[PDB]
Amino acid sequence: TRRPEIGDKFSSRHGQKGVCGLIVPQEDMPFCDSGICPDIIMNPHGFPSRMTVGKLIELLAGKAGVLDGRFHYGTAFGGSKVKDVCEDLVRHGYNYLGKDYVTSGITGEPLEAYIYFGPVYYQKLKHMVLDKMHARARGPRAVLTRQP
Amino acid sequence: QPSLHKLSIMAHLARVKPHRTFRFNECVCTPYNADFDGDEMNLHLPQTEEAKAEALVLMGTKANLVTPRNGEPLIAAIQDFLTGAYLLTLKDTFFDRAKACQIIASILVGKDEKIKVRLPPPTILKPVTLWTGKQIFSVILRPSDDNPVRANLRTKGKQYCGKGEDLCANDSYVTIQNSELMSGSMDKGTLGSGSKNNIFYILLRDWGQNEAADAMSRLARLAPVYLSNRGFSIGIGDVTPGQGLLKAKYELLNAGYKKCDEYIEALNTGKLQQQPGCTAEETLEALILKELSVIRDHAGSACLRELDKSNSPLTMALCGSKGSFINISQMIACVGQQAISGSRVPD
Amino acid sequence: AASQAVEEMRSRVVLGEFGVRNVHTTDFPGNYSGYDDAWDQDRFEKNFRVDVVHMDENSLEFDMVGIDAAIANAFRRILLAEVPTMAVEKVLVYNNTSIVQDEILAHRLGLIPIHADPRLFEYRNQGDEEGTEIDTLQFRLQVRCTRNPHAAKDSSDPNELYVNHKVYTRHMTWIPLGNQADLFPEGTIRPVHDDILIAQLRPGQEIDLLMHCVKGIGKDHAKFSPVATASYRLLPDITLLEPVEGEAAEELSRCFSPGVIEVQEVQGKKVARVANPRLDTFSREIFRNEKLKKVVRLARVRDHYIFSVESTGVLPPDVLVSEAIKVLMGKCRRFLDELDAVQ
Amino acid sequence: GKTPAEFAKLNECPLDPGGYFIVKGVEKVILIQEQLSKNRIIVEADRKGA
């Protein structure tokens, strides 16, 4: 059994692949008014140079899907638009753009900018650090060319 | 592993830590061209005192802050350290005494644990007491009264309007005097690894390697502590187009498609004014590419004007950390001509 | 007036269209013009008060007025990570022949809440794999799955064909050690929710394991945390700048939660007023309506918290909040004692 | 042609797509090779300009 640690590679179903960097306790996470403290904090600098706006719509449509039990379609060249899931979010009392008033867990004071919560389908890739960490002090050498 | 220039291999002073990954500071990602996406980096431990000493003197990180190619620094701040220092050094930010002490006290760790802090005197005094964020950033350059660093710099920022000379409305003319930031915000062109007039390059050329390395460590320590308590986020509301773009884009597409249709008709069934040095069809290709470049550039100049400030792609493009205005225009207004090998799509 | 802006700056966290303002706690000595914010014990003991607005089994919601963010945040963090409970650590396995693997089964048994009251137990020391009367419990699970001897010819559903085909958590039996049979009455020491599906079986397969509950805090592992979640929000005060009359009140009634804006009649005319601002979630939909952006001032009162503690069922949450305060009192006592041991 | 109740007695997944051989215990797939279409006149350029 391998548990995710510093070094285990996650992906995002949009090519936003990235290694884990830091594992913080639950008490140090931010949280909404409703008490949800997020599992995976994703860096917002990945988005302007890569223009993955599909991840920003996946997050929104998944957030609007878990609140009333549907699965929205993200079918290529079609699928559920933004204008429907905005109204589906506003019917349940969240903001129509997914950004939420979010209180910092470290200081207790709220944050100046709103934070963009939602359920995104991450998938763990096979490249784990426990299979890639390797070292050699001195060991077996070749018989012919006496080098490791 | 793919070793392009000579800073693909440097020598660090190791420290042992419990988890299973090589962990280096992110200011050193620009020499290695590392990206933390499952990248592996080799380790080599020299076995001889002469090899240790030659590694430590010639190949240290502090002794190779500048690339040999043109003399511009490579070890400098990178994304989320530029955006942290840009949002720390606007003219808008003000701190009380509590939050200013909390931000300054993040640097009191490591070899800076023994120094006395020298909280600078406040800017506004009578109605409230507010330290401006530029003073909090200037504590990076000189975090104690006995530190002999006196940095000086005077350069243009990125978004400088050209007519200001230290009084621009954008506040984008950097002036640091006696290691105190007097005006202007920290762009990429003042902290980043781009070119000279980097403040770390000034500290390297005037006050030695040790002060440049201490300043980079203090910034890398301080700027996330500010940014993760400010909050900095991007959502679908930040790349959505307003009404002022959805009118102007429709007008631009109608005008450009009319002028393209008139050029097509002027080639096929009439006289088309041939440009010099080429056939008539190449003249048509040049005119159509010119009109489509006008469509993309005017849609970009319309989408940038209606964005609010404190928009996240706009801040990340103004401070030069990640992205540019082409990307914001390309994911709000209009993706341009898709050019294969410098021409339109071949049949 | 400037006095209005300074007073709003230090007690109202206003919510803009684009970003929250006035977020920091600023009432400290020497930060204002004529005010005096030194620590006065009597002004705190006069202003502080607690009003419990709702409580039932496994939940709680109470207001706190006058405490600051850096103390209410400490109460939340102590509830998440320092109020100890009891959870399984060692799963001693005899003959696990199900499809659920042994590691995943031990991990599922770890997360099950145990209804022991953990003020009575002590921390197990370093090592000490056996344990004593004081510092552990012991649970013994033993489920063997067989075919139902009488069954119809159809054989469709699993509920009729098999017996014990689901291993619930009502199949966990407590095994006492020493005087725990007399210390604890029969029926208290049990798994809490009594219906949690642990594994699932087919005839021939058998689970026979033995669990060792210990005392642990939530900082070490998340199975020891007693709260489902515990948070706080600042109590809002939606206020109106200009009077909202006519058909604007109807659309203002829809730009909020369904229990905050009432609309009443005074002269055959509908005027709106804020009725119950506690029930708002701040969807901020007043900023889509263009005519109504300049009539409201959405703000949070800085020093009026609303905690909400939902327990997992280990012990009822008023006792959780009492333990959460006593842990922080103990943390202050420990450093006072180390100062007195130094000097 | 078998039903999902009868893949259980053979220990085979109903969603296993098939199309791969089994030789000496490993599962091998013959990949779809791409070729140029034979018996057709191809007018190409030579290296030297012909």
Added chain:
Amino acid sequence: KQAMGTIGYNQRNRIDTLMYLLAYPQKPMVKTKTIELIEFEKLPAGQNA
């Protein structure tokens, strides 16, 4: 093609050279029609976070 998931319904009777499984897989929250055609939602690879 590298996401850890579930190989099939026979994945416990199957001795292969190197097999990665996910302990608690979940089906995606925003799903394409292709996912409904090739039956990816019956044995998925990944967790909603």
Added chain:
Amino acid sequence: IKAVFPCPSEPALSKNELILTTESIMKKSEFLCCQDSFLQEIKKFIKGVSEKIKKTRD
């Protein structure tokens, strides 16, 4: 150098005094190690600064 070492107790130099004390420094011993081009560039820059002083004081 104007910002790191302000000497408030010293008189400001004119044009002729600047050229004179600049040549009085640059004819010492240690400046023989430098090239001729670098001394020419220093004397060119000092002449430019002296012309700026003359234009301002005029």
Added chain:
Amino acid sequence: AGILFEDIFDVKDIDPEGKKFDRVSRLHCESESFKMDLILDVNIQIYPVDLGDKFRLVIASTLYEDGTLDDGEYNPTDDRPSRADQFEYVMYGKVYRIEGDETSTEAATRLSAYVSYGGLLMRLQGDANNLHGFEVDSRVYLLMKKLA
């Protein structure tokens, strides 16, 4: 009296190039008793400035009217009668660039004094006889009070 400069100013324009910032506005003033013009940045959240307002500005090298030039560190907590009690807005910055104007080719006496209040700039421009006592790297207290 350690006053460097004291005059009455009138606001001519509040925001010349649009509201670039939320809390800071770029005032453009002009005086009555002298021919001074004044570019100024103030914090308009704590101290609002309207279009036709008229305030009295003071620039002093110290806050104590007996002439005590000792300032090792400012103490906000200590209470004693100072110069700031007569005023409503007190900043504190450093003069960093005295610069002669270039718009006239000969026989001009307009000087500029750039004073930077922690980033909030101020161009105090006028005749050279008024600005006596300004030096580079001297630390001044700005003081300011609206008039009826």
Added chain:
Amino acid sequence: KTALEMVQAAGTDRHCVTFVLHEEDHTLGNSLRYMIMKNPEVEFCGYTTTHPSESKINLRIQTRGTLPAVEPFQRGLNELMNVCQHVLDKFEASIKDYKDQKASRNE
């Protein structure tokens, strides 16, 4: 075994000292900073986790006058402890009052 270690500054006699608190984190650090900053003799006070692998905070305290910084640290601890005592008493009284008012109604 000692959880409190006092690292003084280089040149200053006992009025700018850095408290290393072992086996704590942001929980005690933020509350203790809040109760120290109310003391008007403290010019600077703020903590920092040294490294997230480690459970330490470095709580630098710099006083204004001549009093040593151990006394604002002790006063901050005692004031935080008395705040927690008063909160515990008021909260237990409010819980007992709520249960009594609910058990008095609908009977």
Added chain:
Amino acid sequence: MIIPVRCFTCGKIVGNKWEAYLGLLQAEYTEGDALDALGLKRYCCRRMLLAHVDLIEKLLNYAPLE
């Protein structure tokens, strides 16, 4: 494989809600009403039942048995 005992994000016990969730989807509720009637307010609890595949009901058809 089988339903997780606790929700990944908040920590509420979800592993007993599964047999009630299928029972409420036999009586023709929608998922949006069934998750409300089970009492999952936060959406992190709701994705534990809305997105869960029950593989172990279909892995147990392949287990060896007497």
Added chain:
Amino acid sequence: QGRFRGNLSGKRVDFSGRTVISPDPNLRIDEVAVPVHVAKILTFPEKVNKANINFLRK
């Protein structure tokens, strides 16, 4: 894989390691954090002299 290109030009070395990298800003810019499970294997031969006998005994 001959002698020249395989063994003379670039040859394999020992006392080396290879691990996935992950960021950590809390270090100085001239430090790298080596894991424990690599630093127990990689060794440096330190000759015993007068300055470090008491360190190497421990």
